[PDB]
Design a protein around this ligand. Structure first.
Ligand SMILES: Nc1ncnc2c1ncn2[C@@H]1O[C@H](COP(=O)(O)OP(=O)(O)O)[C@@H](O)[C@H]1O
Ligand SMILES: [Mg+2]
Length: 323
């Protein structure tokens, strides 16, 4: 099970339009190419991945890769492996402003919902059209924010002490005292999500908007319970689903700086697992038993060459890592 990687170029934003930024990214099939504005003479570097999403224009274009395309490409495939019983993960990596959340959460407003909102809807919908009767499900969600090696229960604002990430002698890492709520409908789960997104570190310098030096981890513990029409035992399947929103790149955020090391290591294959909490919490989902996929968002702007390239490179290695 080799990690699957996809990159995505968004449309110009407020900053870029001011600087009259030219676009340096081009896409064709499964390949992305970036140009060096400083060195327009040499030949642009190319990159081939599982998916190169071109979303620089708008939904009116025939070649715009909408939230539906992304979801159905990776989302529907991971939620699957989740049903086949595997643990799964999807995380958005990249420079801040490149589009990491939009690919994950997006804007509920009219079909803009991203990977998380859509995955849940898909799950709860699958669970329901299951008119079988030997099948019983359960779904428990958790949402947290990891800023400064500090875990924050985004669904229990009442608590302000940073939750302690611990290692179980026999079961692995887990965040002590972390909300784990059962959800019976997508209407119920959608709500919680709405909450957590808000409860997010207000922080400033970001304009008083969900500052992003921390990771928004969205865990979905899906439980399948099959009944054996004879012996009254129930085969219980259990798969964990993590949907991460990594703080921007740009370059302390140990976690990010550490995930790179692991990524690279995984690409060179022991690992500085405990070196960071993000990794530690995603021990398996990162390099253990589970199928992982990363979505690297990319700024089209020429003013972000050194940060767009970098992302292409970290995305590049990720392609290798195999679980
Ligand atoms: N694929 C996309 N289509 C349209 N707008 C996008 C896309 N990706 C990013 N954006 C725009 O950029 C803004 C920020 O993107 P965001 O999800 O916050 O990225 P980040 O991962 O950098 O935090 C949003 O307000 C959104 O309108
Ligand atoms: Mg975001």
């Amino acid at each position: 099970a080799s990690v699957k990687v996809a990159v995505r170029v968004r449309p110009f934003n407020s900053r870029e339009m001011s600087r009259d930024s030219k676009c340096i990214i081009q896409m064709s099939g499964s390949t992305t190419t970036i140009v060096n504005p400083k060195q327009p003479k040499e030949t642009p570097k190319s990159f081939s991945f599982d998916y190169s999403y071109w979303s620089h224009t708008s939904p009116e274009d025939i070649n715009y890769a909408s939230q539906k395309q992304v979801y159905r490409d990776i989302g529907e495939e991971m939620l699957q492996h989740a049903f086949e019983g595997y643990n799964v993960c999807i995380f958005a990596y990249g420079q801040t402003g490149a589009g990491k959340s939009y690919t994950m959460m997006g804007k509920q407003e009219k079909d803009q919902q991203g990977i998380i909102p859509q995955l849940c809807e898909d799950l709860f919908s699958r669970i329901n059209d299951t008119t079988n009767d030997n099948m019983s499900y359960s779904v428990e969600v958790s949402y947290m924010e990891i800023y400064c090696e500090r875990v924050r229960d985004l669904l229990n604002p009442k608590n302000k002490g940073n939750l302690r990430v611990r290692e179980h002698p026999l079961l692995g890492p887990y965040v002590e005292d972390l909300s784990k709520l059962a959800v019976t409908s997508y209407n119920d789960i959608q709500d919680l999500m709405d909450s957590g997104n808000k409860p997010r570190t207000v922080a400033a310098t970001n304009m008083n908007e969900t500052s992003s030096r921390s990771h928004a981890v969205f865990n979905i513990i899906f439980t399948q319970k099959r009944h054996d029409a004879e012996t009254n035992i129930t085969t219980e399947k259990v798969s964990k689903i993590s949907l991460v929103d990594l703080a921007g790149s740009e370059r302390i955020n140990k976690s990010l700086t550490t995930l790179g090391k692991v990524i690279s290591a995984l690409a060179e294959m022991f690992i500085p697992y405990r070196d960071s909490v993000l990794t530690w919490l995603l021990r398996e989902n990162l390099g253990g038993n589970s199928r992982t996929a990363m979505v690297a968002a990319l700024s089209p702007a020429d003013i972000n060459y050194d940060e767009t390239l970098s992302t292409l490179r970290y995305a590049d290695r990720a392609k290798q890592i195999r679980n």
